[model samples]
Target: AQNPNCNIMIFHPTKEEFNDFDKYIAYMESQGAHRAGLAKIIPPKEWKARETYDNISEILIATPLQQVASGRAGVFTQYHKKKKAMTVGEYRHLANSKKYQTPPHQNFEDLERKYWKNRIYNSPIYGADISGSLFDENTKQWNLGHLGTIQDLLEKECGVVIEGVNTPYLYFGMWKTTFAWHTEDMDLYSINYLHLGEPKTWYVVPPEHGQRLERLARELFPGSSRGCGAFLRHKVALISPTVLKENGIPFNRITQEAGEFMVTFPYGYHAGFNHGFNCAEAINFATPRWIDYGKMASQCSCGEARVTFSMDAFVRILQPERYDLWKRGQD
Candidate 1:
């Protein structure tokens, strides 16, 4: 395929070269970094040994938190304050004016409340309150930070530039048995890197595959809610030391030092599953920002969609200073 977007890069550091926790933390803090979410993946072998401190096999990291930061109370406050005063209907109209169709079964008021609630509490995981809003409103999506980090790293760190577009930070942390296999709303580049634990399975298929899956879902269970299609994507086992491929196609693997890579799926359907035994910790990050289509889309896949309707957006609406930090790349 012709790769256009200059995003996605895979990096494998030798054991001695990996950054320690303190250094890693320091780097982010110095950069005023606030992540959307971070997770630890535990592999089957480690699970069998009951290992809690096993070195992570992969580490998925993205800078300048996207939806979560902008969707917080402070940012959301500023957003509304700028407009002075507006009704939920006005907001929904603005959001839906974009390209995609607004998610079905949503209400504007419900979304506003949910975003505010999540921001005040600062929960690690929560669904974006997207009850009634347009599919592609600024309030419905979040940006990671800027393109500098992605560009600098891809060229300086990774040997190749897989895609051209740098996306904002929006990730779905995969816990035990968690998975996601849905196509993206926007045709942007996206990547996933494993931080710790054993190999997990990831499949990437063409959009046609998603259509097939959707058909099967409707046919198999009449009246059952159908989501993204079922033809599915190719499965890649993310392991360390040794990289494994399904059909002689290598899906970049990193094993030695805290593995990290970017998987660019512009118009592809990708899904991931836990190896079942190991409780691995992996961070899933994205850029350019995209909105979740709510439960209907989520039900068709795995992993919670990091929608912009969370508290992060509410914060952005309230505090301009906080919102500026995210917009200006303070963190």
Candidate 2:
């Protein structure tokens, strides 16, 4: 029913505590919240994700419709390549149709299609800078652009924009839409906010048992992680809670409601299902504290063919600034 280790800690920070974002995160990290690999934050109801434009309906995004009812096993495959392209509006209509809500009447063939989940993943919510970002200085809310020292440094020095890492991504989830178990790219910390939605059920494996989760996954699905340890990044596998429990792996369940923020620590393995139709925004950020963690992750990566941003470049850019400080101190 629940993780034997511990529950995900929920923090309802006061206005003063929330305003100082970096300090609050540092405190949380120091207090061992990261050990759990996931934490939930309930921002005061006053904060809002301000959207200036209303042009999402026309946006053409690919929906990876998955056929999950086939044996109800955790492993799922894409329905087909043909039905993947549609407007956000078109998908909205299909997702909200009453026909898919209740059980199908008679036809077994068509009934299975009813269980297909249309999930829009890794879609960018463009124009955050030109339109309007959720982070407003006047409101003293969390600023998406300036997510603390390390993330800001990456853009300021490297001038590289990594979408879904430094920039935001929008996710549209219908009932039972699944995001398979995976760590954040480059093992960076990621935070997800359910801008508007039904609850999302998250199963997170803490950092300590992250290896155990990997081993079990490899055992269950041989050759999945053959060349790459980060094979879960494919987002195909979805192990059930019952299976996890049976394997004696530690994991926690988190029910993230609308307007709540779920923060995943570096290398934390998380997978979850959407309760119903919903919109969520997520972005990854790295604090100064995570530099070593990021470096370790970069070095440990196998022959995965992903284009990784340069950690060496960041350190090179950072060294000069440190040298200048040392010179000033000596003078």
Candidate 3:
């Protein structure tokens, strides 16, 4: 009943103790690895991420971030933050009401280190998007992943910087602050790099099982479509790992440490909780194969039609010189 392959496949590619780029992708795809459960790979760049965190704390602490009200348990209004943000009746009624918006994000850039410390170690799901990719087309800041390849080639051809996908959202999570169970938008791939902080316990349900969870919620909720499924809040736990386990759905649990990267595959359903307090950055990207998944996701309730930025516009811009061939997630 404790099947690991039922979990995600993991890898640990050291920066120095490494292989060619091809091998790196191979590792990501599980071509040669020997595992079944969820993967917990630790890239060598954890230190580099940690260094960036130190640099930000020292030089970029004044960085502005939008603050959404939160409390000791998690993001907001799901469970305990419910009592903190509102009353028991509001939490119960809004729990099923999809459009009931949580508290709006307030402008909170000038808070003290104590506020940040509390966010990092105690409360608040507040965060800022301060991700600057080292791989800039105009600047030509080279990177370890190689330049002018699929990611960069599309840039020159598409007339846009796909590397902008590398933008990171800084997260300050404390105990119980959760990401909820879901996949990347547009059915894209994502990577969470922990710059430095306490470990986060991640529950990763595989692609198929993850979708099953989605459908499971949809069916259990009855009249609702997958579009409004995300707003179920605590009711989402109907298909959470705990419930999935009771019904015999398998998943992998990995405690991501400081400087580690937690990569979630396309369509994977994952929820994670911070151990104590932690700082992490996450970004999403897509490859050629994503066109199929993206199209399918576009038809779903949480489709891509609402996206302000045009993926086709960017891809069309880089036709011939762009990377038109199929590629895997981290490749």
Candidate 4:
């Protein structure tokens, strides 16, 4: 608390944080998601984004990026990025704006050649979809990743699907492709696993203080600070770790390499960009405690309607099966 900015922590392969991972998740949730640790996580080859999309760019889209902007989309074809956001049919188009070009990669080696040829860089880790080609199938029923954990749980209990068009968000990053600063579902925890790519940079702020950081950003950009949404709307600002650093915030810069897992607690404010052409997949997970947030996101996210998990709808289905998760102590 001495420094009014922030306090961050980091760890390697083995640490106390990993002992009771969920407990750690809960503890951090209450503590404002100040910071946590990460380590190498070797996913099966079938799950790697590069290997899966090597020959199929059709299912992916190239998302352009930029270092600065007027907070508006389509203004900058100058800074573009890449694959895994939008869906491809069921496989979907990303959000909006920008153009989509396809059929660029035939294999990992080929992607690497183009990545360098076009200067792709940076990374973010997520997604646990480990598709086994050996089965010679599009998907396997029992063999799903963590994202599927929530999906399956909801399907079994409530018969509802929340992934929508953007769950299990896939990310392919290049030099300046950045995810603007924001928290997971406005205030939920999130995980970033480098499925396969060079480590990217992440700047996170504790949960309680995430709002204050946004205030600081508003203070910095008074012009666009029309409101929380306007800042992002006026232009998608690419916040620099250095900007917050000079402003007296404490933050740790981690080069989350491939084969690693990173965790950010509830309300943890984070911003990241790729180091080069890299790919990763991520999805939001929640404990029973997240029902309130689901309601809140549905109520109003930043300033728009959200499409997160339907907690209300979920409760209606799961309420009848209370014993499934019934327990005594909070611990």
Candidate 5:
């Protein structure tokens, strides 16, 4: 059965339409009105409570950096072009030195360790402290600041007004190595916009076929060979956002310009490889609202703490006036 909580919707705009944010916004408005309204009515408290049960909904728009330069893609490329030669460790160290200097919370480190030890096997996950409110003790909570402006442009242009409480702010980073195949935490969707960089080799499995595959993988190859149980089990359907084909199959070629595609995932299995080179300035955005605890049919093991604290902090900072709304389920 399809997981009722998780759904993905992709939007592949024409090159001309993709170039104009105004047109894209109009198009999404036609399709996203119902979702937007739902966001408005959700009780604020549901944002937190739903964390344990639902996959966070997302709307992704993929295009070249030149098309969406004001967004995360621009930020990623700027950093990447500047530090192309540096190692991930060196780049991260530099970033931490300048912007992410604040020490992370103790629980954050503990949870990272747990997730790495249990969930991550093939890839190295680096956590940088990109805190905006650290320098100012008077700052009550961290805010995305200018990044919120980018979000505003997206909302206004797409007509898909995500309630600030429901949307995760954009995070720009470079994935140096391949990641362990896995599904997200909540019922959220994602959009990866390729800029001036290598295209990611992405694989997505549908939920229905996912479980059987994982079971087969475990029986065939246990231990490290099994991959991540939850990730390996799902049946993934592949789609190349940058490269288009007549059917669902890939074109076996990459588009040099910009492209945008939507992803409607049901918290199944998925993973990506960096291909021959790093996605020098690849941009990926997802709503950090999925819940992948064992209570659900998700044999996909992941930590609960990251979502809890992150969402808590997010809500407090972004939707401060609606504190009672979330507490009372009116958010």
Candidate 6:
């Protein structure tokens, strides 16, 4: 069943509507957008694009090969564990180069050869931290620091920024560069804004099937899942829609073009690949409901070592009245 009707909800909103995150997401929620695990929002033309890549042009990023050195045939594997370091500008050139732009289905073996030979295979500069490196301060509305929507909760509650989670991260991608399946940290909601370039193809599983996806992952990689329940956070597996459909998992496929937004609900499972050279910035956020999801996510011991937002402090601020009410109940 190629090109399955993923039916990912797409929203076209005016600048005012898109800017009002609460109002927009409220309507989106009412429409059951969360059930899709992810939704795409196409912002009105007035929403101007920003160019922050030049700010960190000299910064070095780790580039990983998309294929395995052992010549194994499968998209789902940890073969990309090893990485090579390259400057952001250098990577941009490689990603934009003619030789690196070929699609995988054409001749992936050739791509693999070029990948090992030249140390580049349209591999992306994925998960590059640009919060402080790219922006001296969080001043822009769209940038991590000044994002009114997600920042409202985080800044109002925590009064501190958590880089790579609350603060913005820049992802530079070329064709076939992938982000493996995983939930947002602490099960917090995540939003990605594509600043410019080719569209990104995403596959997402509904939150209801989140557990089933995890179960399938564990069953498929028993060795990785034996002791760690959150082993998927390692981000090495890539399960195609065919396998997911065969296993009775519901999913939605989405194509996110330039000047669009993709928001993932709490505990949403999403993985994606870039269609071509593109730059995007993303950050994590927590809505009021995310407090409960946060509690559920905290039980996963593997995430204990990762940098965490001050959940307790944020909860107190975000829901002081609720906290007091619950406190009285406990008493």
Every candidate's lDDT: 0.28, 0.61, 0.45, 0.44, 0.30, 0.64
Number of the top-ranking candidate, with lDDT as the measure: 6
**Candidate 4 lDDT, tens digit per residue, 81-170?**
233443233221221112222224675445333432342232222211322211113333211132335445455544676443224555
TM-score of model number 6 = 0.74
Comparing candidate 1 with candidate 5, which one achieves the higher TM-score?
A: 5
Which prediction has more favorable TM-score, 1 or 2?
2
Judged by whole-model lDDT over C-alpha atoms, candidate 1 comes out at: 0.28
TM-score to native of every candidate shown? 0.30, 0.72, 0.58, 0.54, 0.35, 0.74
Which predicted model would earn the best TM-score?
6
Q: Which regions of candidate 4 fall more than 4 Å away from where they truly are?
A: 1-58, 62-68, 71-144, 147-166, 227-235, 288-331
Worst 10 residues of 5 by lDDT: 73-82
Candidate 3 residues lying further than 4 Å off, grouped into runs, are 1-4, 16-23, 32-38, 45-47, 50-52, 58-124, 128-166, 223-239, 298-331
Candidate 6 overall lDDT versus native = 0.64
Ranking by lDDT: 6, 2, 3, 4, 5, 1
Better of 2 and 4 by TM-score: 2
The list of candidate 5 runs beyond 4 A from truth reads 1-12, 15-176, 220-264, 276-331
lDDT of 6 by residue, 229-308 (tens): 66776666777665777788788777788878899998889987676677787877767667677656622344322333
RMSD, every candidate, angstroms? 20.0, 9.1, 11.9, 11.1, 17.5, 7.6
lDDT of 5 by residue, 1-331 (tens): 2223323334444434534433443455356421311111111221111112111112121211111111121011111111223343353343345232322335433423332232222222222222211112232211112122323433454444433332322212332223334454333333333222223444444554455435443543344234443433222212222211222321121122112222323344554433222222211123222222111433222221133333333334344564444334312
Task: Return whichever of 5 and 6 wins on TM-score.
Answer: 6
Better of 4 and 5 by lDDT: 4
